[PDB]
């Protein structure tokens, strides 16, 4: 038989559930494009110098 969860463990679980419920940070296409453009600019600058 599985051992029951103590109070602290339950509270931690609840916190984790709350965290999950919130909207997750996800890397957008736009952000990637912005990064990629900056990388390209950096490469161009390196080539120049």
Using CB under 8 A, list all residues that contact another protein: 1-4, 6, 8-9, 11, 15, 19, 22, 25-43, 45
Three-class SS state of 4: coil
- Based on its alpha-carbon atoms, the radius of gyration of the chain, rounded to whole angstroms, reads 23
Which x/- pattern, by CB under 7 A, does the window 1-40 give for RNA?
-------xx-xx-xxx------------------------
Angle at 3 between CA 17 and CA 5, to 5 degrees: 30
CA angle 10, 24, 4 (to 5 degrees): 15
Q: How far is the CB of 29 from RNA (least distance, A)?
A: 20
Interface residues toward RNA, by CB under 7 A: 8-9, 11-12, 14-16
């Amino acid at each position: 038989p599985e051992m029951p969860l103590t109070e602290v463990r339950k509270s931690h679980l609840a916190e984790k559930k709350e965290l999950a419920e919130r909207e997750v940070p996800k890397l957008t296409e736009e952000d990637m494009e912005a990064i990629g453009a900056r990388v390209f600019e950096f490469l161009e600058k390196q080539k120049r110098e």
